[PDB]
Design a protein around this nucleic acid. Sequence first.
RNA 1: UGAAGAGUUUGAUCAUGGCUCAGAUUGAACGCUGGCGGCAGGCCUAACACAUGCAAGUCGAACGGUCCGGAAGAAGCUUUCUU
Length: 148
Amino acid sequence: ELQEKLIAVNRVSKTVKGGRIFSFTALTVVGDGNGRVGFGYGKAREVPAAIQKAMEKARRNMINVALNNGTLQHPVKGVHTGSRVFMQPASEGTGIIAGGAMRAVLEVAGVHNVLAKAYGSTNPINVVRATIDGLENMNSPEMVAAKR
RNA sequence: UGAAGAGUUUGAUCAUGGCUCAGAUUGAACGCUGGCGGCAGGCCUAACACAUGCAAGUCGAACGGUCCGGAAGAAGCUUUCUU
């Protein structure tokens, strides 16, 4: 069934009036591997409490990547905040060559081969979004033909 | 078939910006730590000054002598001497 992947976890600390309250954050990637992905980022006092809460949010917000022979349709360049992400399809026998933040989202996405890179800001939280955003702008011939 | 950087300016944030960190190479070394074996390699600093040996000779089917070697003579032997 659905498969999860922990991108990264941050301690996170804020100076609240009365002392220091700690709240852990966590980036999770839920995906079956045949065309669906899900990014979640929830907070919690405990690490596991955030991990679980994150996976729940990731499964609530999923997208459908139109995979084609273990690859993507056309190249895309998503630009979230200061961060930037680019994607480019590649023939078989290539391998998911990209950042851990993107690869983890691509592996579960079902993508078998793809070339990518991060530009501008490289924030792990901003790159994942730019990644899922680019996976949305993705279109197929049937879509471009039907929508036209 | 080809592209994942990070740390440091704030009380905190973003932007700008310089510095800095692990990579490969160099006819080297010093500091402290030594067993062995293959292969490879050695003044990257004063073209600073240099002891000593060595770094080009070979031809007599070009021509007269000396040195080294062999053979044959005048002699009973030796000296000497000739071809």
